């Protein structure tokens, strides 16, 4: 599944990620489009031989079992594949475990390079939210 923006922010908002540990629902949406751009499907090798999966690029060296990340863990006890389901509810759980891992956001490359300092609640601009 591919979101749009405002439809991605508000489900994003149901499950609990306006301000979880404190990043404002605009962060998450800001992350999304630059790991994924919205799309439940995307998956990107690693340099590491690890995999991301799905709109929050949820790398399989800690968080998922994909079974190829050889000596990785699988911190959310998922499957990888649950990561790239229409449904983001997984996504969104595993990624509330990241997150709270002590390194905040920074954990996602992408945000900390293009979505941190930012305007971010530009990602959010005109949704009913
Ligand atoms: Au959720
Ligand atoms: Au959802
Ligand atoms: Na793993």
């Given at each position: 599944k591919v979101f749009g923006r405002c439809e991605l922010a508000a489900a994003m908002k149901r499950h609990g990620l306006d301000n979880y540990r404190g990043y404002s629902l605009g962060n998450w949406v800001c992350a999304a489009k630059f790991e994924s751009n919205f799309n439940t499907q995307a998956t990107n090798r690693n340099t590491d031989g690890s995999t991301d999966y799905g709109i929050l690029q949820?790398?399989?060296?800690?968080?998922?079992?994909?079974?190829?990340?050889?000596?990785?863990?699988?911190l959310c006890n998922i499957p990888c594949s649950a990561l790239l389901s229409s449904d983001i509810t997984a996504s969104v759980n595993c990624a509330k475990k990241i997150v709270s891992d002590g390194n905040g956001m920074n954990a996602w490359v992408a945000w900390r390079n293009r979505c941190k300092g930012t305007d971010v609640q530009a990602w959010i601009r005109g949704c009913r939210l």
């Open positions: 949820i790398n399989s060296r800690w968080w998922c079992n994909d079974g190829r990340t050889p000596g990785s863990r699988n």
